[PDB]
């Protein structure tokens, strides 16, 4: 501008705001999708459940004894059973609109819980502080997915986009989000790239917390 104002820095600075804007939208609506407290709050807290049941079951087949594994558990963890019964009793009190009593049991629970424990609150916490990780793991791997999915849409068509399988689109999303960027799977569609910047912006920032947390868990098994 120190020269009767520059022409170049006119028709371009507004052409870029037209490109970022796209991403900002794609990005913005991704933080909404995974933000839907009804859509995402169930999809995640569910994906989580299927993580355990489908896990525990495996740690159960590696024992030959299917139910054998089940008893060994209800056994090594005694509280797991009197707790279940409380849950059932609280729930039958609830189902009957008998909340006054529910008020009670819930409290008569805390006591019963404190008592039978002192190194117990640790096992419950270390367990809670455990499902929380499993929660995060979802939320993240979930946002990753979108990117993957989104890249699928605008890439599946074009000739030899490398992004054929829906899985192939996940590989790209994951490799990208981790910043590893192998490269065996790049978009190839000028538009698929516009999106790639958002999947990158998101997937990395998101994957970061994960690794960040997964990296705190490690500095504990090494100490």
């Amino acid at each position: 501008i120190g020269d009767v104002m520059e022409h170049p820095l006119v028709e371009l600075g507004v052409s870029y705001a037209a490109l970022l804007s796209v991403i900002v939208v794609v990005v913005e609506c991704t933080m909404q999708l995974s933000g839907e407290y009804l859509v995402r709050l169930y999809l995640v807290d569910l994906i989580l459940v299927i993580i355990l049941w489908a896990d525990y079951a495996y740690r159960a087949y590696k024992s030959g004894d299917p139910a054998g594994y089940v008893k060994k558990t209800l056994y090594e963890i005694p509280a797991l059973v009197p707790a279940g019964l409380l849950a059932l009793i609280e729930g039958h009190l609830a189902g009957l609109g008998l909340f006054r009593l529910v008020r009670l049991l819930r409290f008569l629970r805390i006591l019963l819980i404190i008592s039978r424990g002192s190194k117990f609150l640790s096992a419950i916490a270390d367990a809670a502080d455990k499902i929380r990780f499993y929660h995060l793991f979802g939320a993240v791997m979930l946002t990753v997915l979108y990117g993957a999915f989104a890249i699928y849409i605008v890439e599946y068509p074009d000739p030899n986009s490398s992004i054929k399988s829906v899985f192939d689109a996940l590989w790209w999303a994951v490799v990208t989000a981790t910043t590893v960027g192998y490269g065996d799977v790049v978009p190839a569609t000028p538009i698929g790239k516009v999106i790639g910047i958002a999947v990158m912006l998101t997937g990395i920032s998101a994957l970061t917390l994960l690794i960040g947390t997964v990296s705190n868990m490690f500095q504990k098994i090494l100490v």
Partner: antibody
Amino acid sequence: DVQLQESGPGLVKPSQSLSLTCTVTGYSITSLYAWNWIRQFPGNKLEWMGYINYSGYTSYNPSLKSRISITRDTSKNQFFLQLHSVTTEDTATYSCTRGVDYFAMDYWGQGASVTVSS
Amino acid sequence: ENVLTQSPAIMSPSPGEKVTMTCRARSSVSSSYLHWYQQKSGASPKLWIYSTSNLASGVPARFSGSGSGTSYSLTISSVEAEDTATYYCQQYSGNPWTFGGGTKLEIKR
């Protein structure tokens, strides 16, 4: 000292999902009692639709059972109602109340009108 | 659908008069699961009497409730203007909750 607030579209086209968002304040929907949806028809009939309680277990009404879906968002302290494919008859005034001991509903929301029409 | 039936349908009492309403169920209902609400014109219902005879909050003692089985009764020791409204009983037996057809009540002036 508490209050729930119906909110959402006041009009829905035949066979489309009717939606509502009750956001309660002054109490937690995850502490106790049942939070249910009650709709009042033009004839001034009152029909309980169903609920979701502090523990998050839903109890719907048989008649709506195949269309209704009460859910909630513990975070923002608000539960919602969803009705698949409403019809001219589903036009009524939906409102959320709080079920207490023996299910007496002590706190009713403002009441939200919802018209189904083209 | 343990249907509740209220009577009368309309009711035109006069200031000072006493008066009673009725709510009868197809099946029987536990006295502690019977409730009454008072819906004033263009407002949502207000809990008026819970568990048959227990008066809800701000409800004045001019009111009262009693009964059991398959027949309950809401009674006003004396009506007053502020009483114009519609009363609905509510029960909980089977899965579905249920309300009566209400009982309008207009005072005579």
